[PDB]
Design a protein around this ligand. Structure first.
Ligand code: CM1
Length: 174
């Protein structure tokens, strides 16, 4: 028995116009994180992690996230395959993940060399989850980019306690 804020209709999620797959590659730090399964937790606050996007020759992305947990670096790898329009993707090899029936990625906005906001929605064990990441080329972003991320998250039904700014760290992600 779970309770979740509903996924917003896709019409409320903008798409980055003219998406350039080659320029979005590289490392992105997660300076902000929001979603219906994201919960602030002041006692053990979320540490910053990073996600690296590499264009494979077939134009799919090989995606690697790295987090510092239990004194070690944990790597998670997935494949994002170009979806219905430039800037949208679905998950490769969905079959290999137990209980996952849909996964959508939409790049909301980016200038490529400093910041990005990406929307994700998936259905896992029949529950509909969504999150928005505020990506930075550096671990810090202006208070202006942060507020904007907050406004957008709220615009999708999320309250403040479902929006966090992971704390910068040096382990694993540099
Ligand atoms: C292990 C534990 C905590 C943790 O560290 N999880 C991180 C792992 C690294 C990437 C950030 N992230 O996004 Fe997870 O991805 C989501 C995608 C769409 C909507 C919601 C989520 C989501 N993930 C968090 C989550 O808690 N997932 C579950 C289920 C875990 C298995 C399914 N999930 O949930 C995955 C699967 C694989 C790694 C994805 C790699 C790429 C990129 C995205 C990014 O930049 O955040 O990501 C979980 O048990 O997580 C909360 O919402 C996490 O889950």
């Amino acid at each position: 028995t779970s309770d979740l804020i509903p996924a917003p209709p896709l019409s409320k999620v903008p798409l980055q116009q003219n998406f350039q797959d080659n320029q979005f590659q590289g490392k992105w730090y997660v300076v902000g994180l929001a979603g219906n399964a994201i919960l602030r937790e002041d006692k053990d606050p979320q540490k910053m992690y990073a996600t690296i996007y590499e264009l494979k020759e077939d134009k799919s992305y090989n995606v690697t996230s790295v987090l510092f947990r239990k004194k070690k670096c944990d790597y998670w790898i997935r494949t994002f395959v170009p979806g219905s329009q430039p800037g949208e993707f679905t998950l490769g090899n969905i079959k290999s993940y137990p209980g996952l029936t849909s996964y959508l990625v939409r790049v909301v906005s980016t200038n490529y060399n400093q910041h990005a906001m990406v929307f994700f929605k998936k259905v896992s064990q029949n529950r509909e989850y969504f999150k928005i990441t505020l990506y930075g080329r550096t671990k810090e972003l202006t208070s202006e980019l942060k507020e904007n991320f907050i406004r957008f998250s709220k615009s999708l039904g999320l309250p403040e306690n479902h929006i966090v700014f992971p704390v910068p760290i040096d382990q694993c992600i540099d």
